[PDB]
Design a protein around this ligand. Structure first.
Ligand SMILES: CNc1ccc(C(=O)O)c(C(=O)O)c1
Length: 438
């Protein structure tokens, strides 16, 4: 397969559903390269657990943790890392209120080259245990010979775009990694980077980040087809922000408008949103505690009940993961019969203005609160007009894209409700015999 899109291993499913999945111990294995140094970008860390995931022979190599914690949270993380003299920390600046360092990325420097891993899991045991999570694995990027002058750039501009994303941190520890990336050849990369960084972007910079970045790539590197109005948009996520009092405020006016872009020329497009129902959570492998990683508040939800008519259940028979609650986030553009897709995005970004950006100043400024990162698969980057959807995720041409959940998505029933994490559920017990009392 050219796509190098993986799911994490799920404890308790049959082996056929983990053959081809990756655990963190597999990613860090000496089989992937001889580690010299690594950077772990994430939101939440269990440092004791994380170090044990490295091979014992690599556990004293330098590790940089890139996080967004402040005040007592920052103090707690430093206390976690203090026992390990090889661990350094980088606090990403969050100068806009209510922002989050949400990006999940590994930079892995080897004796043999460099690897980039962009994924969706926190660095804690539970996120790699019984959840549906996504991973993109870069090729092994060889080093450019000293004295040789070449760009090492891919047709998707991934090298410059990754350096641009790291430059936005304005951090000395990340300038070191920028210099590492400069010395490697990333020309085999076939995905486009889509990042968010905090700020207020106008003019030339408006297309650099968030949903305007997605719009620009789809304008420049996708083509519109006849009946494009019939090709749905699918969004799939683990958290929902405050989107406004109706769909015209953001969801269907700028978010959907960016998502439905195809090609360069100047809506009835169906919008499917996939988010676990209460029943999905109750009957999951984890039970109700899976809802601790689905942070949708009652105070947010009751201001936007209009949104829930867009919601579809989590179902993933194709990958054996219907009971493995999703922490992956994905967005895609299927055909009207869901047999093909025009593009696929795996990202850290949930369905929120903080992650994707919201227009300000009479539409001239895109404001983003958070750090996010994902990779976009476009058929043009593989010499194709569209991707065929793989019928079974772990089954056997390799030019079919492995969509990890079932199509078409199934609408909530009349008795279904979205998972809301801070209200009680005491009518029926979960798979472990328990209720949910926040
Ligand atoms: C908006 N509140 C969230 C904070 C952190 C995370 C994470 O897992 O990093 C998530 C999520 O991805 O569901 C949401």
């Amino acid at each position: 397969n050219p796509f190098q899109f993986y799911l994490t291993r799920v404890s308790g499913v049959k082996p056929k559903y983990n053959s081809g999945a990756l655990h963190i111990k597999d990613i860090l294995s000496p089989l992937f390269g001889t580690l010299v140094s690594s950077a772990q970008f994430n939101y939440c860390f269990d440092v004791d657990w994380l170090v044990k995931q490295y091979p014992p022979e690599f556990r004293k190599k330098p590790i940089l943790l890139v996080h967004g914690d402040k005040r007592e949270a920052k103090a707690h993380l430093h206390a976690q890392a203090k026992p390990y003299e090889n661990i350094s920390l980088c606090q990403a600046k969050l100068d806009i209120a209510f922002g989050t360092h949400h990006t999940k990325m590994m930079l892995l420097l080897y004796e043999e080259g460099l690897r980039v891993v962009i994924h969706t899991s926190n660095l804690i045991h539970a996120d790699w245990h019984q959840k549906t999570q996504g991973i993109w694995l870069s090729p092994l990027y060889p080093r450019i010979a000293d004295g040789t002058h070449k760009s090492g750039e891919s047709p998707t501009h991934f090298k410059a775009d990754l350096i641009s994303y790291l430059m936005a941190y304005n951090a000395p520890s990340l300038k070191e990694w920028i210099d590492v990336i400069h010395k490697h050849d990333l020309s085999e990369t076939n995905v486009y980077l889509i990042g968010s960084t905090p700020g207020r972007f106008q003019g030339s910079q408006k297309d650099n980040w968030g949903h305007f970045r997605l719009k620009k790539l789809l304008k420049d590197h996708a083509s519109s087809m006849p009946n494009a109005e019939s090709w749905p948009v699918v969004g799939q996520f683990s958290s929902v922000g405050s989107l406004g009092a109706d769909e015209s405020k953001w969801l269907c006016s700028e978010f959907k408008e960016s998502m439905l872009t195809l090609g360069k020329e100047s809506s009835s497009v169906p919008l499917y949103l996939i988010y676990p129902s209460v029943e999905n959570v109750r009957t999951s492998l984890e039970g109700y505690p899976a809802g601790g990683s689905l942070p949708y508040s009652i105070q947010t939800a009751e201001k936007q009940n209009w949104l829930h008519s867009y919601f579809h259940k989590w179902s993933a028979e194709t990958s054996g993961r219907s009971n493995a609650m999703p922490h992956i986030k994905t967005y895609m553009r299927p055909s009207p019969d869901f047999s093909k897709i025009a593009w696929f995005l795996v990202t850290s970004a949930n369905l929120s203005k903080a992650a994707w950006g919201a227009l300000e100043k009479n539409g001239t400024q895109l404001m983003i609160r958070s750090y996010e990162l994902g990779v976009l698969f476009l058929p043009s980057a593989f010499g194709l007009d569209s991707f065929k959807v793989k019928q079974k995720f772990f089954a056997g041409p390799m030019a079919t894209f492995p969509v990890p959940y079932d199509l078409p998505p199934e609408l909530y029933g009349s008795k279904d409700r979205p998972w809301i994490w801070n209200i009680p559920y005491v009518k029926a017990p979960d798979t472990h015999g328990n209720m949910w009392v926040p």
